[PDB]
């Protein structure tokens, strides 16, 4: 008469509606990613038909990988990297693109590779390397219940909710991005390309903006 079985019946019930909620919201996101890319593809086709030029929306998210080690850094980019939580080589963080962050990126340009992450790389980074900051204590994500315990107050209940708040820069992007402990990436698996890293990507190195080629590099580092 400690009465476990009714509580286990209640808990296994409550998990079932919670996975039902997650399943329909993932279906909601899956349709909205698909129509968004279809609209952009059709908008370019329509503008080319209508003699015009579709100009894309400018990118709202970058993913910043620090590609330089610790020693001999000047004081100003050293502080900006700490405020972007890139405290060691091959660390990664998503950064919402505003003017206040577009000038942080120009300060740390010869130490980082950044660029525009796709849905696939956001999905794979959070799946494989995704950790949470919970009593600071770096908890691996590994279960949707420890996302809802810490981000449910912003309506983020699963791992695919967390990806959705990152790729679509939502109103609670800051709380979802600072929840993620900075991604501890490996070295890239086919190397870097580029016999010398520490020139700009435009001149033939690695650092700076490689706008959509961050996806090749981060998936090699994953």
């Amino acid at each position: 008469a400690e009465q476990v079985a009714a509580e286990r019946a209640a808990r296994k019930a409550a998990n079932k509606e919670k996975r039902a909620i997650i399943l329909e919201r993932n279906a909601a996101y899956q349709k909205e990613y698909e129509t968004a890319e279809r609209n952009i593809i059709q908008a370019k086709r329509d503008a080319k038909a209508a003699g015009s030029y579709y100009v894309e929306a400018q990118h709202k998210l970058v993913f910043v990988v620090r590609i330089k080690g610790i020693n001999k850094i000047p004081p100003k980019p050293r502080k900006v990297l700490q405020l972007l939580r890139l405290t060691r080589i091959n660390s990664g963080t998503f950064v919402k693109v505003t003017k206040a962050t577009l000038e942080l990126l120009k300060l740390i340009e010869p130490y980082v590779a950044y660029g525009y992450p796709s849905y696939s790389t956001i999905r794979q980074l959070v799946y494989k390397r995704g950790f949470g900051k919970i009593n600071k204590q770096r908890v691996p994500l590994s279960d949707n219940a420890i996302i809802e315990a810490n981000l449910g107050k912003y309506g983020i209940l699963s791992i695919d909710d967390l990806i959705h708040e990152i790729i679509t820069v939502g109103p609670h992007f800051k709380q979802a991005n600072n929840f993620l402990w900075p991604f501890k990436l490996s070295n890239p698996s086919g190397g870097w390309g580029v016999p010398r890293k520490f020139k700009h990507f435009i001149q033939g190195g690695s650092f700076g903006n490689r706008e959509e080629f961050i996806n090749k590099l981060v998936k090699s580092m994953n």
């Binding site: 080690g69 610790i70 850094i73 990297l81 700490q82 405290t87 060691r88």
Partner: protein, 185 residues
């Protein structure tokens, strides 16, 4: 390598146990470690911390300080809690009936409390009759009234009591103390 933003392996800077090897005080810490873990009342966390405190961090609380806190509005029937020593005061001539829970009572402060019908209570009797700190009132003695705090921050234009052995004329009342002899401080 890690671009550290903080000193690695930093201790908290707080006592987690008393430095004293008092056997009975370890028992009280053992009693209140359990309470602060299991009760969720904030009284037991404050009390357990104050058991750790050093002798200058537990100044005595006078019985006239006990009586003046019972003059507070609606606090006449609370339980005064002093994690430390309760001392007498003959400067006060009327003492109220009350419950005082302290570590130690001096032989005069035990007299002035039990003569007025009060009770001097050890903190384990307090945890029995008030395990969540119900209707309690923590009193702390004056820390900065110590004779050592006067010499802290002695410097120019500070007014902070020079570390001296000899007092009076010829002892530091000259050049540096009056505008006549040299300069003034």
């Amino acid at each position: 390598g890690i671009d550290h933003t903080s000193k690695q392996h930093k201790r908290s800077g707080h006592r987690t146990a008393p430095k004293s090897d008092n056997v009975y005080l370890k028992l009280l810490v053992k009693l209140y470690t359990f309470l602060a873990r299991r009760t969720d009342a904030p009284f037991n966390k404050v009390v357990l911390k104050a058991l750790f405190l050093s002798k200058i961090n537990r100044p005595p609380v006078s019985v006239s300080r006990i009586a003046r806190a019972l003059k507070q509005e609606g606090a006449a029937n609370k339980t005064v809690v002093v994690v430390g020593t309760v001392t007498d005061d003959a400067r006060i001539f009327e003492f109220p009936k009350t419950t005082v829970a302290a570590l130690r009572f001096t032989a005069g402060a035990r007299a002035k409390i039990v003569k007025a019908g009060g009770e001097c209570i050890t903190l384990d009797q307090l945890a029995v009759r008030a395990p969540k700190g119900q209707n309690t009132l923590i009193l702390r003695g004056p820390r900065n009234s110590r004779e050592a705090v006067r010499h802290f921050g002695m410097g120019p234009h500070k007014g902070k009591a020079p570390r001296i052995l000899s007092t009076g004329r010829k002892f530091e009342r000259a050049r540096g103390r009056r505008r006549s002899k040299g300069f003034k401080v």
